[PDB]
Amino acid sequence: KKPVALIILDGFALRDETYGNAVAQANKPNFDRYWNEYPHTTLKACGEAVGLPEGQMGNSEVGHLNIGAGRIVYQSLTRINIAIREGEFDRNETFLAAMNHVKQHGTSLHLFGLLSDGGVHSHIHHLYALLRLAAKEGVKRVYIHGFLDGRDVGPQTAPQYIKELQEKIKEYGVGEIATLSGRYYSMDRDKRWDRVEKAYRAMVYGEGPTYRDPLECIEDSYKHGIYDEFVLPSVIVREDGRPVATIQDNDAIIFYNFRPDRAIQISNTFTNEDFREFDRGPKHPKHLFFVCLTHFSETVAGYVAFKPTNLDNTIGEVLSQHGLRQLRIAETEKYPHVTFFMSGGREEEFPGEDRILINSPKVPTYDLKPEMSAYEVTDALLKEIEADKYDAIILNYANPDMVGHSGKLEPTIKAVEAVDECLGKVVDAILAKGGIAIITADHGNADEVLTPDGKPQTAHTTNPVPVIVTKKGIKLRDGGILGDLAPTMLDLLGLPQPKEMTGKSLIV
Numbered sequence: 001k002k003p004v005a006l007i008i009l010d011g012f013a014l015r016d017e018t019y020g021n022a023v024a025q026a027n028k029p030n031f032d033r034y035w036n037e038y039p040h041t042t043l044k045a046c047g048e049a050v051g052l053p054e055g056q057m058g059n060s061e062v063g064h065l066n067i068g069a070g071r072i073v074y075q076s077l078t079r080i081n082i083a084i085r086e087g088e089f090d091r092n093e094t095f096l097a098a099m100n101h102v103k104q105h106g107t108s109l110h111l112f113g114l115l116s117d118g119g120v121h122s123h124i125h126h127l128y129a130l131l132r133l134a135a136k137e138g139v140k141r142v143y144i145h146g147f148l149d150g151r152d153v154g155p156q157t158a159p160q161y162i163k164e165l166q167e168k169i170k171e172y173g174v175g176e177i178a179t180l181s182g183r184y185y186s187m188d189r190d191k192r193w194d195r196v197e198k199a200y201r202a203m204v205y206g207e208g209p210t211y212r213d214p215l216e217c218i219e220d221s222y223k224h225g226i227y228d229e230f231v232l233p234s235v236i237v238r239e240d241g242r243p244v245a246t247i248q249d250n251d252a253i254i255f256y257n258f259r260p261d262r263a264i265q266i267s268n269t270f271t272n273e274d275f276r277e278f279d280r281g282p283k284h285p286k287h288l289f290f291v292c293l294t295h296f297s298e299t300v301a302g303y304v305a306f307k308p309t310n311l312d313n314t315i316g317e318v319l320s321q322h323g324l325r326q327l328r329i330a331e332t333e334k335y336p337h338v339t340f341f342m343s344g345g346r347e348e349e350f351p352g353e354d355r356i357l358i359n360s361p362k363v364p365t366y367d368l369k370p371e372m373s374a375y376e377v378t379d380a381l382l383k384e385i386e387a388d389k390y391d392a393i394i395l396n397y398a399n400p401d402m403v404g405h406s407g408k409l410e411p412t413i414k415a416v417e418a419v420d421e422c423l424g425k426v427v428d429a430i431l432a433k434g435g436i437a438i439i440t441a442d443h444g445n446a447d448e449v450l451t452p453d454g455k456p457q458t459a460h461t462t463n464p465v466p467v468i469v470t471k472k473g474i475k476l477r478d479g480g481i482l483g484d485l486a487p488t489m490l491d492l493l494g495l496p497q498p499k500e501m502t503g504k505s506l507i508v
């Protein structure tokens with residue numbers, strides 16, 4: 001059994017500038033020798049090359065979606081942007097049905113989601129659009145529950161988004177900031193229900209740090225070293241001390257996040273008839289008209305503003321169609337990406353598809369444990385390899401990305417070095433079994449964890465990702481894109497390429 005392994009170094013991209021560049025500064029003997037001894041190239045992992053607006057940096061969802069589809073996969077950010085551009089956004093039956101619900105039943109419209117222009121999980125402009133739509137539709141009570149970013153944008157940039165939103169509110173003549181919470185709580189994806197609950201109780205019970213002024217809230221949190229991403233779920237109150245608004249029975253909610261991994265948990269908390277993760281309390285809200293900007297999960301009992309579209313014949317499906325055994329493996333943080341997103345937005349495994357989930361460390365932030373669970377993932381996978389069970393493997397090492405999001409150089413360097421020690425063990429074990437490895441990344445991040453002035457850089461970058469095919473005697477094209485990865489693997493696998501995969505094998 002000669003396995004072909006797709007190894008994704010999450011957040012590992014190529015950048016000449018070495019300042020604050022953890023990828024370039026890390027000692028990567030393994031990665032370096034493979035780059036030197038095998039055919040390599042780089043791929044466009046951002047902008048139109050991956051289905052996003054030009055200039056928009058990539059991410060795990062976009063990257064893994066494109067990597068597995070073998071075609072340029074059109075993304076939500078782009079599609080919704082166009083909807084707003086073409087005057088289609090205001091015509092959305094779901095947005096309107098939700099607005100009709102509050103007016104007809106005299107309830108309130110709640111708007112929550114990532115408050116920034118990161119463009120990864122949402123865009124603050126989409127919120128402005130909903131607000132103007134709400135005003136246009138004559139919806140009296142509209143409340144904003146903002147989730148502070150700091151991960152897709154500057155670590156202490158909330159004030160400007162809050163400031164701009166307030167200005168927009170005044171201008172549209174509708175809306176009220178009710179709560180402010182760090183995406184660390186309201187947008188968790190690691191089933192850390194303790195985090196989720198904090199966000200939930202602030203929004204439904206007005207429990208959490210209280211302020212009259214949204215900006216005084218952020219100021220106070222900064223004062224305690226707590227920045228945007230980790231801001232404690234707080235409540236904005238009126239002059240009489242009462243919360244500006246809590247989510248109640250028959251209210252409508254429009255979750256304006258278009259990325260699913262970090263939206264399913266809080267969405268389930270609000271819509272699940274029987275929720276057990278934790279006790280929502282007897283007076284928790286029911287009969288909520290819940291709207292998801294895009295599809296999150298079958299579990300969320302709500303509606304979908306922008307319906308999803310099938311992604312047929314992705315690598316996972318082609319591999320399955322030809323009777324091959326495939327294994328998806330990664331630790332928690334990137335488990336959703338190597339499965340759901342890699343499978344083209346599919347939850348169910350394909351026949352013949354095995355998945356291994358290795359739990360990420362129990363640390364608040366990963367700069368605290370840069371090697372994360374890389375070694376366990378590696379150990380786990382090395383065993384599978386000895387077993388001779390899989391024809392195809394899709395491995396994702398989360399470290400470069402996960403610890404690079406801390407905006408810290410030394411821990412990210414360690415992160416990269418840990419992954420390298422691991423990368424060598426895996427590629428060396430695959431070559432020994434006669435297989436071949438495709439070493440790559442889904443986008444940048446670790447290549448820049450410090451701003452030119454040395455401040456923490458906590459988000460992705462727009463640089464190109466590396467590509468190494470451990471097969472002597474071949475040449476790789478140069479202007480490729482992620483959507484070319486699937487075709488290359490199939491080529492290596494000698495499996496035929498489906499017409500759906502409009503990508504092109506990198507092998508000359």
Ligand SMILES: O=C(O)[C@@H](CO)OP(=O)(O)O
Nearest residue numbers: 059060061120151152401
């Ligand atoms: O952590 C996340 O949700 C994003 C950043 O907002 O990173 P990635 O796309 O790598 O998952």
Ligand SMILES: [Mn+2]
Nearest residue numbers: 010059060442
């Ligand atoms: Mn990623």
Ligand SMILES: [Mn+2]
Nearest residue numbers: 011401405445
């Ligand atoms: Mn990331």
